[PDB]
Structure formats: C-alpha cells, structure tokens
C-alpha cells in the first residue's frame, strides 16, 4: 500500500472500525493492542502485540515503521477507564487513565512526527469524547473527562508546531457508540435512557459510522484541517 | 444523478468549489446566484439565476425542486459584506448582512426540510467563518461576525429538530481562503501579514481544499455528524 | 449617584434583579420596559416607559442620558419568545425574536458607546442563555437559540472595537432561573424534570443569584474582562 | 476570619494578588510556596512553606486545615513551565509541567473537598490560561497548553460531582499579565509585539486586576456559578 498507518486499540470497537476503514482506503495498516492477531488477519492488517499501559511507546512506533516501511498516519484509539467518582478514586487509578489516554498520546505522536516529516506528509488523529466538552452526565468519569479534554490542548499545540512539516493533527470526538467498552452503560436504563434522550438521532452510533469521519481526518480531505476537534455524536452536544 | 443539491453563491469562490466537488460525487447540482450561467455550464450544473438579497427564498427552493426532480442537499454559500466598524455602520447595512447570511439561511432551510424529510435523507450545510469563533482581528466586520456566529445556534437548533427526519445540519467554517471576495484583504500587508502569521500552515487555502470537507458534510460520511461546526482553517484558530 | 446605568426589561425577572443589584452598588439606575413605574418606585430607579419591540432604540438611550445625567452602563435584559419549532414558525415570528434580542442589542449599544466613550468608562452587558451554547433540549426555541448565540459574536466584535475607549462588553448567560417568563416551563414535569436532572446543583436559580454576577460585569471587577460569555447555570452546561 | 482559604503559589505574581484580594474580603488566608514567609508577613497571611513539585498534596491541605481552623477555599496558583517545543521536550519535562499543574490540582481538590463538604460551603479555583483555548501562538509551550486545557475538564467533572455538597468549582483564565514569570516574554519584541497586537485593550494586565475576578469566584457571587472557565484577558481571545 501507499500510506502507512498505525492504529492503537485497533483490535476492538472504534479502533478496529478505523483500521478497517483505512484498509478500505488502500492504506497499509498496522494494528496495535494486547491481542491484535485475530483482528489483523480478518482486516488484512499487520499485527503489533503490545501493552501500551506499560511498553515504551517509542518502541511501538519503531516497530510500526519497520513493519510498514514508513509511517504517515497515527491513530491512538486505545481504551481504558476507571469509572469512579473523584472522592473514591485513587491516585494510581487516576494516573492509569491519564497515562494511557494522554501521556501515551504525547509519546506516540512525538515519536511518529519525525517519520511523517521525513515523508513530508502526516496525519495524527487523537480520539476524544463528548467528555472533551462535558463531564459525562450520569456517569462518574472524572479521570477520563480530564484526559479527553486535555487532548484538545495537545491537538492544538502539536498542530501549531508541526503544520509546516506537512502534518495535520486533529481530535475525533465520538458520541455514544455501541462497542464492548460501552456495553456496561447500555446496560441499566438508569444511564442509557437519560443519555439517549439527549441524542437527537435517537440512537447510539455503530463503530463504522464513526470510522467514516476518522478516515477523512486521516486523508487528503484534511489537507487544510488541523488543530480541531470534530464531534460525531448524533447531535448529543447540540441538544 | 441520484442526490439532488442546491448551492447558493455557487458561481464564485467557495460556493463554486463546493458545487464542483458535489458534481464530482455524482450529485445533480443546481447553482444559484445573480449570474450562474457560465459556472453552471462549466461545472455541468443547473443554473438558477436569483438575487437572494431580495427574491423569496421559498421560491428558489421550489425552482430547485422542480429543476432537479427532488432536493436532498442545501448549501448556503452566498456572500456579501459591509466592512465597517459598529459606530460607522448604518442599520440598513447591518440588516443587509444579517439578512443574506442568517435570515436567508433560515428561510432556505425551512423550505428545504420538508423535501428532505420526504426523501428520508437530507444534508444542510451552512457556511461559517473563523469569525464564528473570533471577531476578525484587524478587520472591522461586526455584522459579518455576528451573522456567522448566529449560524452556529441555528445549526444546533435545526439539527436537534430535524435529526429524526433523516436530516443532518452542520456549519462549515472556512479559514482564510483565496477568492475574489477576500482579494481586498490579501491586498495590503497591513492585514494580510498579521493574519497569515497566525496560520500555522503559513498559507491561505484554495477553494478546492475547503470543498473537500464540504463534500463530506454533504455525504454519507456525516450520517452521525450533526449540529456541529467544522473549522477548516490551516490551524488559525488553534494558534 | 456616580455611575449611570440603563437596564431594559428592568421591571421583571432577571432584569429587575440586575437593576436592584446595581442600585445596591450605588449606581443611578433607569429601568426601561412597557410598565416600569411600580418597579422603579420600589427599587428607587428612574422609570422609562418604552416598547422596545417598536420604539426607536436611539431614542431610549437619549432619554436615559438626559434622565441620568450621563450613561456608563447598558444592560439589555428585555425578554420575548415564540416557542415554536422551525417548521411551525413564521418569518414574522422569527424576526420578532431576533429583532428584540439582537437588532435592539446592536442599536442600543451603538447609541450608548459614544456616551461611555465620552466618560472614558463603560460597561455593556448582553444577556445570553444556556442556548448560547446548546439548542434548548426538550424546548422548541430555534429563534431564541439563534439570537442568544448571535449575541456572543456581537459581544466579541464590540469588545474588540471599543476596548481602547474604556468600554468592556460581555455576555451574561443565565441558566434556568425562576421568573414569570420561565413559569410555563417549570409547569409540566415533561420539561422541568429532564432539565433539572442535568443541573448539578439540583435546583433552578433565584433572579438575585444571577444578578450578583451581572453587577460584577457592570463594575470595576471587569476592568480586564471583555469579549467573553459568563455562564451562571448551576453547572448545567458542565454536566 | 470567617472563610478559610489556601492559595498555592501565593507568594508571587497572580497567586500573591489573589491572596491579597482574599485577605481584603476578610478571609483567613494561608499562602503556600517554597518561600512564603515574606509574602505572608506582608499580606497578613499564614505561611506554609512547601515544594508542591515533590511534597504530598494531602499533607499541605491538612496543614492548612489545622493552621486556619477549617478550609473553605482552594486556589491552585502555583506556576512552573518548560518552554520547549514537543520534539525538543523530554518526557520528564513533560511530566514535570503536567504534574504540578494538573496532578497536584486533582490531589489538592480531592483532599480539600471533604472539609468544604463538612462546612457545607466551598470554592475551588483552578488557574487556566489563554492556552486553555489556544496553543500559545509564537511561544512553544505544548506541555503547559495541554495542562491548562486539561483543567477545564477537571473543572467540569469536579463541579458536577460536588455541586450538591455546597462546593463550586471554576477555572480562572488570566490573559497576559505582568509578573516575574512572564518577564522573559515581555522581553524581546519578537514575542511581546505580536501578542499585544491581539489584545484589544492594548496592554498587559496587572496581577491585581486578575485578582478582582478571582475574589468573585471565591465568594458568594459564585453561588450559582460552577463548572465554568472565566477568561480575564483584555479581549485577547475575542480578537
């Protein structure tokens, strides 16, 4: 393939859908997660087993580089969360969420940029949330909310610094999507009902619907689109 | 063609580029402006001569409907401006800007929605600006700034109301684009220099680069994207 | 008194509370509305009977000037609304809402600025809403939403232009407040319940609580605060 | 005094000005920093020497509690920065900035809340920046930008969770203020000129002007104001 892409958290949910959409655009994709084998074989992608909660990010980027023969696109879709209120949350749990979502985002982008710069073209796509703009409503997720909001600042900062290198950096903010990760929410009506009532479209999204936009932000369509957050939430935030 | 689209201000600048991109997607497009003939013939679109600053908007939508055999997409890219500071601006000049940019946006969307609802699928694309989020900097454009910001509220409101009808409504916010309309700005360095210094990419956009994103917001890619503003500004706002 | 203030819609709800808070700060206040007599006598303010939906705004400002012996502060708290969805709303109803909320805001500020500039100090306070940032949720108010959002653009534009004249311009965005105007909402639980569930503080505001912040934005506390919106909503938007 | 307040970074710049304004409101204030002695004696505050970049935050809050006889207000104004672009920044430097600005913000608030809840009234004031909304322009501060933006998410999250406990949580976003910390910026015109050109008021703020608003957000004026960011920037963001 032509453009080379690395997608973390690419074996499940949104990450997997993004990897699939990229393969569809003719990109050579590498999927990174703890168990990427099955997904990689199904999607026709390169598997890169890794534990991003502990393994050195720079090491994953180097493996992606040598496995793909280059690096043009980076999508950090890895997921993890500790749904506990601030007063019940430990510092270790706090740092776990912030580390994977923000620290790793920084480390991966920092390691990838020089290769995108070398190619003269790059796309960095961070994954946000409706919590990039709100606090999650009935769900107690202060750490996740803080991390996903922090990504907007990182997005603007890196976009500003790397624009002249041919790199565009944006934040895709998915709304409420049907994935294994959000399954415990679609669970009890106590949470699903109030949330869904605020979604104009009246339904949660399918991972593939979110991926359509991700592909755009990883393509030539985003040539002049950088340092921005793009919310794909069925109208939730506008409600 | 399959999907039917009406693009106002479609004979020049951004509007023309959007019409061209839509034709490229295989849409049957109608171009509306005072003198749409040449552009329509060049792009392979249907011409609909109109003076949106005076002609009844509902009349233009009906003509588009009967000319295309349906109506699925509406892009209000008409342009006009009175670059005068608030204390030097007359009420007539104020209303002229607000009328074309906001009042006509409302009237066109209101008239189009029932036809999109009839089709069970629709896309409304309003055109914003960096002034949807700022005041224009060195340029005195209070009326334009107010109008383009007001469009964000209209966008959210219509998106909420029409989501269940199959209609998605968004606001495309172009940054500084090279068009005849902005020519008097790229004019003296007094204005061009300060502005460009704040654009990370270091250059103004080409109309076609803005149109790439417009096409997305007028397509299946936006199935779950509604009630949002999308800034394509080369990083200006993130700076 | 020292500082002179004009407050439209100052005989009821939020407007009245703001007028009362200003009188408390020792300002000489003028209250404008169709029937300001009783409120003016109760608050110790100057009454200026007017129908801002039809009377020339410049005329009201001139009357305020001559009635107070100057003009330093302007608060446009007049209210009016047509709670109808876009497809059921007439253009006349649309313009009625936009005229009073936005057109009059512009006209009043434009007429007041020269007097504030003459004094070398001024405060313009526009009144927003949670709909300056959202679409009102279960309530169908597209015109109001558009108007209150448009005020953010006007706020930024005038703030930029008049900053060097000693004028600060901001937008106070009240959340859900208990007033006669919102009474029909606190009415049926169908609307009150869903909304209140999204307010962290679990209750609607009292007009006086909103006025505390209004006073600040009309005082020396705002010396370096201009071109901003300040939401006082009990946490609704952050939810 | 009645209300008890802890202000970190309270011996210099904005932090010191906030402490002074609070003492002026009749609050019993404790100032925390590495060398708070001189400032505490000058302001009439309680000194709490600490190195927040290494000392346990919970320990500082406990010392404040026992030193003041309670805890109602928390202002985290400590400052630190590594002005290096992303590609030149080390992970240790990144974590240093994020630790003091965000991690410590979380830890201090988490430790303080139970005491505010015990009192049935509390005010948490985090310190943002124009970089809570932009990337700093000509200044390379990706870590600081990310941290100050992340604080907006934390602000919303804690505000939502603690609202019913009588605690209000907000983010004060100062613009460009004259302090020792920003001295190296007001230094060369290369940076000062471009920035100042974007400030409508045409000048940088004095610490005391920022403190006026801080006091408000730490007082009864904020009774119904929570989960919000308030920018006091002389119009910079609105430009």
How many CB contacts within 8 angstroms connect chain B with chain D? 17
D239·B135 Cβ contact <8 A: yes
Q: Choose from D157, D161, D165, D229 for mutation: most chain A CBs within 10 A.
A: D157
| DSSP structure class, residue D146 | H
Count Cα atoms within 13 angstroms, Cβ side, for A193.
5
Q: A153, A163, A227: which to substitute to probe chain D, counting the most D Cβ within 10 Å? A: A153
List helix spans (H) across D25-87: 37-43, 57-68
Q: Which residues of A touch D137 (CB under 8 A)?
A: 160
Percentages of chain A per state (helix, strand, coil), in multiples of 5: 45, 15, 40
For residues B58 and D105, what is the distance between their CA atoms, to the nearest angstrom? 55
Token pair, residue C83, equals: 């709670």
Counting Cα atoms < 13 Å in the Cβ hemisphere of D115 gives 25
Rounded Cα distance between A213 and A128, Å, is 13
Contacts of B106 in chain C (CB under 8 A): 86, 91, 94, 146
Could you give the residue numbers annotated as active site of A?
144
Tracing tokens 């500004």 back to the chain, one arrives at B233
Phi, psi (rounded to 5 degrees) for C31: -110, 125
- Please name the residue that has the structure tokens 């107010």: B146
| Contact (CB<8Å) A134/C197 | no
CA distance A135 to chain C (A): 5
Torsion of CA A74, B17, B134, A232, to 10 degrees: -40
Q: Give chain C positions within 8 Å (CB) of B147.
A: 150, 153
Domains in chain A (CATH in brackets) are 1-239 (3.40.50.720)
Distance, in Å, from the CA atom of C222 to the CA atom of D79, rounded to the nearest integer, reads: 24
Across the interface, of C102, C145, C152, the residue whose CB is closest to B156 is C145
Instruction: Tell me how far apart the alpha carbons of residues B76 and D64 are, in angstroms, rounded to a whole number.
Output: 59
CB < 8 Å to D200, chain C: 159-161, 163-164, 226-227
Contact, D9 vs D60, CB < 8 A? no
In the sheet with D122-127, reading across from the earlier edge strand, the strands are: D46-49, D28-33, D4-8, D73-76, D122-127, D167-174, D229-232
Cβ-defined contact of B238 to A155 (cutoff 8 Å): yes
DSSP per residue over D161-191, as a string? HHGGGTEEEEEEEE-SB-STTTTTTTTSHHH
| Cα–Cα distances in angstroms (integers) from residue D194 to residues B204, C97, C224, D139, D199, in the given order | 19, 40, 19, 11, 9
Instruction: Judge whether D79 is annotated as a binding position.
Output: yes
| C144 annotated as a binding-site residue | yes
From residue A82, give the alpha-carbon distance in Å to each of A140, C141, D146, D157, D162.
Answer: 9, 38, 21, 14, 19
Residues of D with a Cβ under 8 Å from any A Cβ are 85-87, 89, 91, 94-95, 98, 102-103, 106-107, 109-110, 113-114, 131-132, 134-137, 140-142, 145-150, 152-154, 156-162, 227
- DSSP state at residue D54: T
Annotated binding residue D145: no
User: What is the b/e burial string over B150-188, where b = at least 16 CB atoms within 10 angstroms of the residue's CB?
Assistant: bbbbbbbbbbbbbbebbbbbbbbbbbbbebebbeebbee
In 10 A of CB B16, how many CB atoms?
26
Nearest residue in C to A198, CA atom = C137
Q: Answer yes or no: is B51 a known binding residue.
A: yes
- What is the 3-class SS of chain B, one letter each residue? CCCEEEEECCCCHHHHHHHHHHHHCCCEEEEEECCCHHHHHHHCCEEEECCCCCCCHHHHHHHHHHHHCCCCEEEECCCCCCCCCCCCCCHHHHHHHHHHHHHHHHHHHHHHHHHHHHHCCEEEEEECCHHHCCCCCCCCCHHHHHHHHHHHHHHHHHHHHHHHHCEEEEEEEECCECCCCCCCCCCCHHHHHHHHHCCCCCCCECHHHHHHHHHHHCCHHHCCCCCCEEEECCCCCCC
Give A103's DSSP letter.
Answer: I
C144 is catalytic: yes
* 3 state SS of A56: coil
> How far is it, in rounded angstroms, from Cα B159 to Cα B167?
7
Residue whose entry in the numeric block shows the structure tokens 């004031």: D125
* Token couple for B80: 């006009």
Cβ-based neighbour number of residue D75 at 10 Å? 29
Asked how this structure was determined, the answer is X-ray
Resolution (A): 1.8
Give the whole-angstrom CA distance, residue C148 versus residue A230.
Answer: 23
For chain C, the DSSP string reads: --SEEEEETTTSHHHHHHHHHHHHTT-EEEEEESS-HHHHHHHT-EEEE--TTTS-HHHHHHHHHHHHTS--EEEE---------TTT--HHHHHHHHIIIIIHHHHHHHHHHHHHHHHT-EEEEEE--GGGTS--TTS--HHHHHHHHHHHHHHHHHHHHHGGGTEEEEEEEE-SB-STTTTTTTTSHHHHHHHHHT-TTSSPBPHHHHHHHHHHHTSGGGTT--S-EEEESTTTTT-
Of the candidates C207, C83, C204, C209, the residue with the CA atom closest to the CA atom of residue C136: C83
Number of Cβ within 10 Å of residue C180's Cβ equals 9
On the CB side of C145, how many CA atoms lie within 13 Å of its CA?
A: 30
| Residues of chain C with a CB closer than 8 angstroms to some CB in chain B | 85-87, 89, 91, 94-95, 98, 102-103, 106-107, 109-110, 113-114, 131-132, 134-137, 140-142, 145-150, 152-154, 156-162, 227
Q: How far is CA C54 from CA A89, C34, C51, C66, in A?
A: 57, 11, 6, 21
Residues of B within 8 A of D238 (CB-CB) are: 134-135
What is the DSSP secondary structure assignment for residue A188, as one 8-state letter? S
Round to whole Å and give the CA distance between B116 and B218: 13
Structure tokens, D182: 């920003």
| Secondary structure (DSSP) of A146-183 | HHHHHHHHHHHHHHHHHGGGTEEEEEEEE-SB-STTTT
Q: Which of C27, C91, C99, C144 is catalytic?
A: C144
Nearest to C239 among A137, A197, A238 (CB): A137
Q: How many cross-chain Cβ pairs, C to D, lie less than 8 Å apart? A: 112
Of the residues B157, B158, B167, B170, the best mutation for testing chain C's interface (the one with the most C CB atoms within 10 Å of its CB) is B157
Whole-angstrom Cα Rg for chain C: 17
Give the Cα separation of C164 and C120 in Å (integer).
9
The partner residue sitting opposite D157, judged by closest CB among A145, A154, A161, is A145
Inspect the interface and report whether the beta carbons of A238 and C134 lie closer than 8 Å. Answer: yes
* Distances, alpha carbon A15 to alpha carbons A6, A123, A179, A219, C94, in Å: 10, 16, 10, 16, 44
Which residue in D153, D155, D156, D159 has the most chain A C-beta atoms within 10 A of its own C-beta, making it the best mutation to test that interface?
D153
In C, minimum Cα distance to D156 occurs at C238
Nearest to D73 by CA among D213, D175, D214: D214
Contact D149 A153 (CB under 8 A): yes
Sheet with A122-127: list strands edge to edge: A46-49, A28-33, A4-8, A73-76, A122-127, A167-174, A229-232
Q: Closest chain C residue to A134 measured between Cα atoms?
A: C238
Report the alpha-carbon distance of residue B122 to residue B65 in Å, rounded.
13
Residues of chain A positioned with their CB less than 8 A from the CB of B210: 224
3-state DSSP call for residue A5? strand
Q: Please list every residue in chain A whose beta carbon sits closer than 8 Å to the beta carbon of residue B151.
A: none
């Amino acid at each position: 393939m032509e453009r080379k892409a690395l997608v973390t958290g690419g074996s499940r949910g949104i990450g997997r859908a993004i990897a699939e959409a990229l393969v569809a655009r003719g990109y050579r994709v590498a999927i990174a997660s703890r168990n990427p084998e099955e997904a990689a074989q199904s999607l026709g992608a390169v598997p890169l087993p890794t534990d991003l909660e502990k393994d050195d990010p720079k090491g994953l980027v180097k493996r992606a580089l040598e496995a793909l023969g280059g690096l043009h696109v980076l999508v950090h879709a890895a997921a993890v969360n500790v749904r506990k209120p601030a007063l019940e949350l430990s510092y270790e749990e706090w740092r776990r969420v912030l580390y994977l979502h923000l620290d790793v985002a920084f480390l991966l982008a920092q390691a990838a940029a020089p290769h995108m710069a070398e190619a003269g073209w790059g796309r960095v796509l961070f994954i946000g949330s409706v919590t990039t703009f709100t606090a999650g409503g009935p769900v107690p997720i202060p750490a996740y909310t803080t991390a996903k909001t922090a990504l907007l600042g990182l997005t603007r900062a890196l976009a500003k610094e790397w624009a002249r290198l041919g790199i565009r950096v944006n934040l895709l903010c998915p709304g409420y999507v049907e994935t294994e990760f959000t399954l415990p929410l679609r669970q009890n009506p106590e949470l699903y009902e109030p949330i869904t009532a605020r979604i104009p479209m009246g339904r949660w999204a399918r991972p593939e619907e979110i991926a359509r936009v991700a592909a755009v932000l990883c393509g030539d369509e985003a040539e002049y689109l950088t340092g921005q957050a793009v919310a794909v939430d069925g109208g939730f935030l506008a409600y």
